[PDB]
Design a protein around this nucleic acid. Structure first.
Ligand SMILES: [Mg+2]
Ligand SMILES: [Mg+2]
Ligand SMILES: [Mg+2]
Ligand SMILES: [Mg+2]
Ligand SMILES: [Mg+2]
Ligand SMILES: [Mg+2]
Ligand SMILES: [Mg+2]
Ligand SMILES: [Mg+2]
Ligand SMILES: [Mg+2]
Ligand SMILES: [Mg+2]
Ligand SMILES: [Mg+2]
Ligand SMILES: [Mg+2]
Ligand SMILES: [Mg+2]
Ligand SMILES: [Mg+2]
Ligand SMILES: [Mg+2]
Ligand SMILES: [Mg+2]
Ligand SMILES: [Mg+2]
Lengths: 181, 76, 138, 214
RNA sequence: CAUUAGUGUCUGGUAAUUGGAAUGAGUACAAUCUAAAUCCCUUAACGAGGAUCCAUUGGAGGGCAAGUCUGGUGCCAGCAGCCGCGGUAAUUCCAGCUCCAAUAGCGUAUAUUUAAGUUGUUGCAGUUAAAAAGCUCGUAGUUGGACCUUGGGCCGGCCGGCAUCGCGCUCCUAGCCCGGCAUCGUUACUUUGAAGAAAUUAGAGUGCUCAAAGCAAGCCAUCGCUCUGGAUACAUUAGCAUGGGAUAACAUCAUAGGA
RNA sequence: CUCCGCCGGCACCUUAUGAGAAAUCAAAGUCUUUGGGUUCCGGGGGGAGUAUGGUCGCAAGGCUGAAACUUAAAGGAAUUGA
C-alpha cells in the first residue's frame, strides 16, 4: 500500500513544567499582543526557532574553512535574510543565535496586515485574513500564519473580490438593499 | 577581557598575590597590601614606596614573612 | 576501585551485566513473573462479578471501601476491584460483565484501601463515569 | 539619617566613591548597607523563601522565621542574605540588609566568539554548600538559563543570560542550594585566566589615598 | 486642568445594551473532479443577534495555576498518584457560583524513555547511612620503571626538496652522469581513499495559498517552446588500499650458524 | 647515660591551605578543575541468609542462594528539650 510512504511530523512540543507563573505570563503576553489563538501557535514558533538555533550552534562549533560550515552558513543566512529575520550587515551567523521568537511572530501575515494599516486591530486583522479578504502577490491567502518574505512585503493588498479592496458587496450589504427596495 | 571590537568589557581587573600569583578576590579579607618606603638621602624619606600584595592563603600558611623577606630583596 | 585497563572491556561489561540484577526495576521487568500476575501483562481485563464485599480503611482513616470481587474471564483468577464514586456500588449487580483496570502505582496498593490494586471502570458495556454523571443508562 | 561609623562610610557620604569596584579591588569589608545603596542605584531585592525553624523548650516549641533574600542589579552584582527573626517582616528586613552587605562581583564571558556584550560565565565553575554542588557551564548565546527555579532567579539577578547548569545533592534543601549557587557565582573572579596574566600595577588603598581627610 | 475636579484615554468589561458591515459551517443550479461516481478547489441563489450556528475534558490545601464564598453531610458517604481530608464552623466529600489549565480536544490503565550521577565507560558508592572476603599464597585475566637521533642547518611562498657521519638494486615508473625501488619482524593506533541500496535521518533548491508535504517547477510575447532540477552528507565493528612510526603490544645478537 | 642526624616500625599532639552529612580524618587530603594499577563488594525497609537445588561435614552446621507477598519510610550524624 503506497501512500504509507508519505512523511509527516510534529511541529510543537508541550512545556516540561505545566504550571509555572513566570512562563505562563510571559506566554500570555505574546498570545495577546500578537493576537494568537492558543498556546500551540507560540510553541510551534519556539520549536522552529530551536531547530534553526541547533543548526546554527552546530555550524558555529566547527572551524571556518570547513566547507560544510561555509555552504550551510551561507544558506542559513540567506534563509534568515529572505524572511527579514535579520538586519543588514548581520551575516555573521552569530547573530542568528541572538534571534528571538518575537522576530518570527513579527512576520506573520496577521502582524504585517495590522502594521500596514488595513486592519485597525490585531484581531480585526486575523478575521480579515480568514475571510478571503487579502492577497499577497495575486493569490487569496487565508492562513494568518503565512510568514511573508521581505520581497513580497510590498505586494500585499486587499483581494480583488472582497468589498474592502475589490468588487461586489457582501451578504448583508445586498440583503439590506433588497429589503429596502 | 576584551570584546572583539577592541573594547574592554571586564570591570575591575583584580590584583594578584605577589608571592603565589593567585587572585585576591573581593571577599578575601585576610589579604594585605604593604607599601614599604624608599630611603634615598638627607631626610631619608619622601613619598616613594614599593607595594606588595599578599593573599589570605599565604598569610594563613605563615609563609607571609618569608615571602615578604624574599620579595623585598630586589634591587633598583 | 574501578578497573581502568584498556583491555578490560570484558570485565566492565560482565560486571554491569551481573550488577543490573540488583536493581528492582530491571529485575521486575526481566525475570518473567509479570506473566504470572492476574492481568498477565495487560492494561485491562473483563470479568464477572462474584459478590460485593466492602473493606475497611487503614488506621489514620475510618470508612468502608466498597469493592466487588470479580473473576477474570481470560484466566479464571479472583480479584477485588474498588468501585470509584459515591453510590456507584448500587450500579453493580450480581453476575454482570465488568471491565477492570489497574489502580495506578503499577500493581501496588493505592491509598488507604488494603490489598486492592484494581478498579472497576465499565459495567454491562457502559462507563461508570456515564452512570455517575447520568449521560447514559444501562 | 546615616551618620556612618566606618572610614568607608565616611568616604561614601562625602561622595568620593562612585562605583563598588574601588572597594572590590582592595577587598575591603563593607559593614554598612548604605554604602551599597548609594553606589548601586537600581538594586532589586526579592524574597525567595520563608522557612519556619523551631527550638524545643519545656513550655513548648519556639518558632522563628528565616528569610532568604537575593538582591542584585542585573548587570553583574549579586548578594544573598539570610536572616532569622521572631516575625516574618523583620526577618525579611534583616535579610535585605545582609544581602546588600554581601554584594559580590560576577564576571561574564563569551561562549565562542567575543561579539557584543558578555552573556555567559567565563568558564566551567562549581560551588558547594553542605551536600549541594552546582556546576555552571558556558552556553551558546540565546540558549537561555537551563537551571531550576532557585539558581535561575539567582542567575537572573546576576545578569547572566545563557548557562548550562547541573546539580547534585539535596537541592530540596533550599538554603544550601541557594548558597551553593551564590558561592559558584562569587568564584567566577577567582580563576586565573591568561588575560589576567599581566602583572598588576597596584593602587593606593582608600584608607591611604584619603589619608589627610580622615 | 491635576488644582477642586472631573471622565476619556488604549476601551478593559456585567452589559439576552443600539447599529449596520464581514464571513464560511450548512443547502445547492452549474462547471470541474473521476474509469464511473464521490470529496476537495471554483461558484448562481439561499444561509448569523447571541436563548442561538449554545466547546469540552480535568481541576481550585501542598507538590501545582486557580476560593480561608454559599447550602448539604458529620471519621458516614466519599475524596485522595504522595502528604493527607471528612468525628456539627469541611479551603480536600456531595452541589451551586466563581476562578484555573489545555482547547477540538482532554482524562484514565498498562508498557517504555526522561528525570536516574538511583547501574555510574563518560559518572555513583563501601569507618559510622546498604556495602572490604578472617588472613596469606597462587594460575588464567587486567596492569607494568628508565634507555637506542631526526637533533644542529640550507631551501622556497603549514609543507615540500636537501644537506650533517642517508645497508644496495637488474626488473614498472626511469632527469637534461640525476630525485622518488619494489620482498630477506609482525600488529594495534592514526591519516587519506575506494566500495558501500532505497526509504528513514540531517541537509541544498523550490510560495502544494501556509503547514504537515511532495519532487517539483519557472519563464516565455506567461504564442508552434526555452531553461531545467531531481544536490550533498552520516553510516560504529569487520574486510580492501594509502602515508605516519610518537604511544603500546607480540617476536628477538652472545653458540657470531653475522654481514 | 647525654646531644645530633638518616633509614624502618607501633603510635601520639597541634593545625587547615584540604575533605566530609557531620562525628571526625595528616590521610577518610591531592574529586563536577571528576581518569596511577588491581581484587572483592552495595542499590529503600522487610520477607531472609528464609525456601529450594548443588556442594563440603560424623554431626552441629559451613559455602552458594531466590520468589510470592508486604510496606512509606527504615536509617546516619548533629541540635534544642524532656
Ligand atoms: Mg528503582
Ligand atoms: Mg468545567
Ligand atoms: Mg472535584
Ligand atoms: Mg494540587
Ligand atoms: Mg497556588
Ligand atoms: Mg488519580
Ligand atoms: Mg502518612
Ligand atoms: Mg486536591
Ligand atoms: Mg467543590
Ligand atoms: Mg547511590
Ligand atoms: Mg548499625
Ligand atoms: Mg553498615
Ligand atoms: Mg598472573
Ligand atoms: Mg623514625
Ligand atoms: Mg535502588
Ligand atoms: Mg534492597
Ligand atoms: Mg542518634
Amino acid at each position: 500500500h503506497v501512500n504509507f510512504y508519505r512523511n509527516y511530523g510534529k511541529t510543537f512540543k508541550k512545556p516540561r513544567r505545566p504550571y509555572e507563573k513566570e512562563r505562563l505570563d510571559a506566554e500570555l503576553k505574546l498570545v495577546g499582543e500578537y493576537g494568537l489563538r492558543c498556546k500551540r501557535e507560540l510553541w510551534r514558533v519556539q520549536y522552529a526557532l530551536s531547530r534553526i538555533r541547533n543548526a546554527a550552534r552546530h555550524l558555529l562549533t566547527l572551524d571556518e574553512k570547513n566547507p560544510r560550515r561555509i555552504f550551510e552558513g551561507a544558506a542559513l543566512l540567506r534563509r534568515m535574510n529572505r524572511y527579514g529575520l535579520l538586519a543588514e550587515g548581520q551575516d555573521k551567523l552569530d547573530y542568528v543565535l541572538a534571534l528571538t521568537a518575537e522576530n518570527f511572530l513579527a512576520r506573520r501575515l496577521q502582524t504585517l496586515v495590522f502594521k500596514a494599516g488595513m486592519a485597525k486591530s490585531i484581531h480585526h486583522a486575523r478575521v480579515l485574513i480568514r475571510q478571503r479578504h487579502i492577497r499577497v502577490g495575486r493569490q487569496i491567502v487565508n492562513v494568518p500564519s503565512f510568514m511573508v518574505r521581505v520581497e513580497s512585503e510590498k505586494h500585499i493588498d486587499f483581494s480583488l473580490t472582497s468589498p474592502f479592496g475589490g468588487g461586489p458587496a457582501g451578504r448583508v450589504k445586498r440583503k439590506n438593499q433588497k429589503k429596502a427596495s | 577581557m576584551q570584546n572583539e571590537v577592541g573594547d574592554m568589557v571586564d570591570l575591575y581587573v583584580p590584583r594578584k598575590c605577589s608571592a603565589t600569583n593567585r587572585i585576591i578576590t573581593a571577599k578575601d579579607h585576610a589579604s594585605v597590601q604593604i607599601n614599604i618606603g624608599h630611603v634615598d638621602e638627607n631626610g631619608l624619606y619622601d613619598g616613594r614606596f614599593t607595594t606588595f600584595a599578599l593573599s589570605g592563603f599565604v598569610r594563613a600558611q605563615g609563609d607571609a614573612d618569608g615571602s615578604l623577606d624574599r620579595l623585598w630583596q630586589k634591587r633598583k | 576501585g574501578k578497573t581502568r585497563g584498556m583491555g578490560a572491556g570484558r570485565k566492565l561489561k560482565t560486571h554491569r551485566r551481573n550488577q543490573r540484577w540488583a536493581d528492582k526495576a530491571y529485575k521486575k521487568s526481566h525475570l518473567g513473573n509479570e506473566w504470572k500476575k492476574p492481568f498477565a501483562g495487560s492494561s485491562h481485563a473483563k470479568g464477572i462479578v462474584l459478590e460485593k464485599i466492602g473493606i475497611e480503611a487503614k488506621q489514620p482513616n475510618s470508612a468502608i471501601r466498597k469493592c466487588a470481587r470479580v473473576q477474570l474471564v481470560k484466566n479464571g483468577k479472583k480479584i477485588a476491584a474498588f468501585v470509584p464514586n459515591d453510590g456507584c456500588l448500587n450500579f453493580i449487580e450480581e453476575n454482570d460483565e465488568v471491565l477492570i483496570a489497574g489502580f495506578g502505582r503499577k500493581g501496588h496498593a493505592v491509598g488507604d484501601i488494603p490489598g486492592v490494586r484494581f478498579k472497576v471502570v465499565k459495567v454491562s458495556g457502559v462507563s461508570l463515569l456515564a452512570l455517575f454523571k447520568e449521560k447514559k443508562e444501562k | 539619617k546615616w551618620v556612618p561609623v566606618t572610614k568607608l562610610g565616611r568616604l561614601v557620604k562625602e561622595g568620593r566613591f562612585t562605583k563598588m569596584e574601588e572597594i572590590y579591588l582592595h577587598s575591603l569589608p563593607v559593614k554598612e548597607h548604605q554604602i551599597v545603596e548609594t553606589l548601586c542605584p537600581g538594586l532589586k531585592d526579592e524574597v525567595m523563601k520563608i522557612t519556619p525553624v523551631q527550638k524545643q523548650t519545656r513550655a513548648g516549641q519556639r518558632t522563628r522565621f528565616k528569610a532568604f533574600v537575593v538582591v542584585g542589579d542585573s548587570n553583574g552584582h549579586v548578594g544573598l542574605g539570610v536572616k532569622c527573626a521572631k516575625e516574618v517582616a523583620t526577618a525579611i528586613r534583616g535579610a535585605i540588609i545582609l544581602a546588600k552587605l554581601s554584594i559580590v562581583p560576577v564576571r561574564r564571558g563569551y561562549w565562542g566568539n567575543k561579539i557584543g556584550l558578555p552573556h555567559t560565565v567565563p568558564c566551567k565553575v562549581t560551588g558547594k554548600c553542605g551536600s549541594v554542588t552546582v556546576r555552571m557551564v558556558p552556553a551558546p548565546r540565546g540558549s537561555g538559563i537551563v537551571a531550576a527555579r532557585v539558581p535561575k532567579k539567582v542567575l537572573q539577578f546576576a545578569g547572566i543570560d545563557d548557562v548550562f547548569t547541573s546539580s547534585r545533592g539535596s537541592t530540596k534543601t533550599l538554603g544550601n542550594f541557594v548558597k551553593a549557587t551564590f558561592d559558584c557565582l562569587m568564584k567566577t573572579y577567582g580563576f586565573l585566566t591568561p588575560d589576567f596574566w599581566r602583572e598588576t600595577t597596584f593602587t593606593k588603598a582608600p584608607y591611604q589615598e584619603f589619608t589627610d581627610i580622615l
